Design a protein around this ligand. Sequence first.
Ligand SMILES: [Mg+2]
Ligand SMILES: [Mg+2]
Ligand SMILES: [Mg+2]
Ligand SMILES: [Mg+2]
Ligand SMILES: [Mg+2]
Ligand SMILES: [Mg+2]
Ligand SMILES: [Zn+2]
Ligand SMILES: [Zn+2]
Lengths: 132, 103, 218, 343
Amino acid sequence: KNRAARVRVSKGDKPVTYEEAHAPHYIAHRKGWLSLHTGNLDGEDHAAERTVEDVFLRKFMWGTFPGCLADQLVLKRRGNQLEICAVVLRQLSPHKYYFLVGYSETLLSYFYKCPVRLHLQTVPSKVVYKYL
Amino acid sequence: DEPWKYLESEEYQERYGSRPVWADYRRNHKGGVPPQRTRKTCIRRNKVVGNPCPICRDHKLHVDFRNVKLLEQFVCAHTGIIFYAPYTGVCVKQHKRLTQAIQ
Amino acid sequence: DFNDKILNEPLKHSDFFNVKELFSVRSLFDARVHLGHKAGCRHRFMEPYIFGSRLDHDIIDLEQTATHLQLALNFTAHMAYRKGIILFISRNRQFSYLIENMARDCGEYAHTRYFRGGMLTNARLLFGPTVRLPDLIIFLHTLNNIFEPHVAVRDAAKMNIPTVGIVDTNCNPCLITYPVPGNDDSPLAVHLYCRLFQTAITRAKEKRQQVEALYRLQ
Amino acid sequence: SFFTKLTADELWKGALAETGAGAKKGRGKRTKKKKRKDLNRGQIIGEGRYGFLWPGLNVPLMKNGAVQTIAQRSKEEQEKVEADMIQQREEWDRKKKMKVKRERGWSGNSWGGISLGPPDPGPCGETYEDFDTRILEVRNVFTMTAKEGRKKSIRVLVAVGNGKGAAGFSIGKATDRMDAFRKAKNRAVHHLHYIERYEDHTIFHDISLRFKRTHIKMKKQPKGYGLRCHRAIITICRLIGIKDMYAKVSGSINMLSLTQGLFRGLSRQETHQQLADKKGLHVVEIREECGPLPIVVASPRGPLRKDPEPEDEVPDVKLDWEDVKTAQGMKRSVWSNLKRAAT
RNA sequence: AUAUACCGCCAUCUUCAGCAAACCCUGAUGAAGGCUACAAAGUAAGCGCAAGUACCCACGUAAAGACGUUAGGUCAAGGUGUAGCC
Ligand SMILES: [Mg+2]
Ligand SMILES: [Mg+2]
Ligand SMILES: [Mg+2]
Ligand SMILES: [Mg+2]
Ligand SMILES: [Mg+2]
Ligand SMILES: [Mg+2]
Ligand SMILES: [Zn+2]
Ligand SMILES: [Zn+2]
């Protein structure tokens, strides 16, 4: 009996997402990686910094877009340029959405001394894979 | 109001309905059978006691010989004998007052 | 309301679809319907339908047989003219082919195979929320292979469905609405009941169609 | 550190401790429960202790058709907003924690005289708001298992009725209280027992029977008699629609057998109309209020019989020494005639 | 300090195969049970097993291995409820 990044089977009243449902040993078999960089590859370096500041990015953006997201993020770092992809709901106003978009993008760029971009996908209700 | 028009007033009908007055009241007491004699009174020294009877809690109601439809519901329409105070839910004081009023 | 008048018209009439002309005690005795199992196979509630016994074999009262058969045919044809759903049951494997063929020929449906638990009670979850359960059940063989009362009579008595079964000396006509004494085992009796039901329901259908055609004309 | 900090739901789980030895085995704890709270829903995302006025989220972006500018909230304004937020949190907490007043039925902390309302509509669609439900009994059955051992299974008995002579009881077992209630409610609304009554408020005549070492006696009564019967019996009478009778129960006391025998007797009670139809005689009622006047109630639907019944003298009839005593007046007991509650 | 508040992470039977929401039925409507295929009341969501995926295959090995038991171990990975030094 192992407990690792997996949801307990309940009576059947727990909507779950794809990755939130599937186990951590199918990350390559039936899932994709949340992040894509080369520090893990051989010969590269600074992978520790990559991971640490990626965790920081995830936490900061999760807490500066609270209650709107419904899934984990997608990182995409091509050379210099950084890209983040998110999914959110449409309860708040596009005014606030764009204001926070610009604010967060500027903060990330000024902090990392790096060109950054961020995209969001709107949803009326978070997509559920199964009822667990 | 000292007269009996508070009954015909709509607050009475919306507050009670077609049922009698005693039907809404219920007694809090010891286990199983309740006591055989109700409380002495519901008001003392210009103060009301918790869980009062309906005729005492609704101060606008006024017991009197003339409010026939107000004091008729206690005595059974098919049995001329009045019900007892543990049945009607009211205290012995106003119960006796209503007895001499109906007489 | 004329539709309700047409629905009620056959009620006041007695022998209105001419079901009596179909059967006669001659045909019953020729098909050997009067037979019954041994006295050891006798049943209390079946006693009154036994005209007598011989050689440890029981004999059926053919007048009561014809009366119950007349009532059964009349009822079947009544709700057939009302388009009431019919459903046949016979656990006996000896006649599944014939039963299913005659069911196809009539247009009414049947279930000869193994009956599943609560197929009628939980039919909503099985089939769907909106399903028109049958309006009449009938039985060419009331008991199962192990000779217990088929669960369908219990299901119908529960969910208010009428039942018409041919009852042998071992059967239990208590739950059945219009139990007709007869010979569950003889192929002559099986074929006779088949042809009788076919003619009956076909005449009921034809009469419905011609009545509604007359009404469309008028 | 900030990296050490994490999301909320896991802290909530670790603080609530839903799963453990504490809860498993059903031992539980000494009734201490910190209730779930949601802080993110409460406060708006915009304001903090530094009171910058945000035109994008905190203030409407346009005013008088004029773009806005970043501004500062003054000391008194910040303090007043914080006091308003304190008041709002206090209001929310008060509204959260309050009393719960479920009607007192047979007694406190008991599921006897409580109604869950009518059954739910059917799948095909059948609303039965006319039906009213009551819970006769709730008990904690326990059966063991090799894997887990003592597992509790709530058993409940319920009844439902129109108040129009049509009703029915049922049972429901489940691990969950609400789920068992629902299952029993569905089973009752499916399985119905109808019974007739003489003048909409009484039985046809006195009855006496036993069922599983449970003796019961129904006693017909006239109007204004009331319902002086066991609490379950008066609940089922309220549900049926009869307003007065008497009943006595002796022997064993078991609620499910009680209800089963009750429905059996009240269904086997034979209508006096059908009695006359079978007999060939006219029914005649006589009252104490009405003088020597024959009140015909029913007649045979078929032809009346030619000759009348012969007089039956010293007939063989089984009866009750208790009723004999009460009729003779020799009986004495403080517990018989009391000023009990209303009906 | 409290693994006897817990989360998080694992040993255990497991070199198992059962766990089961939601319905029906039997037992007089009890705890409970629901199996007979030439078949007699069980139907099953879903989980798991399994299958497929990884290594050299389809076998094999790994991985996976639920419901629950040991108030199993871990407040010393880290955080956190309660009680304390403050
Ligand atoms: Mg392991
Ligand atoms: Mg109490
Ligand atoms: Mg421990
Ligand atoms: Mg496997
Ligand atoms: Mg392994
Ligand atoms: Mg331990
Ligand atoms: Zn008073
Ligand atoms: Zn036979």
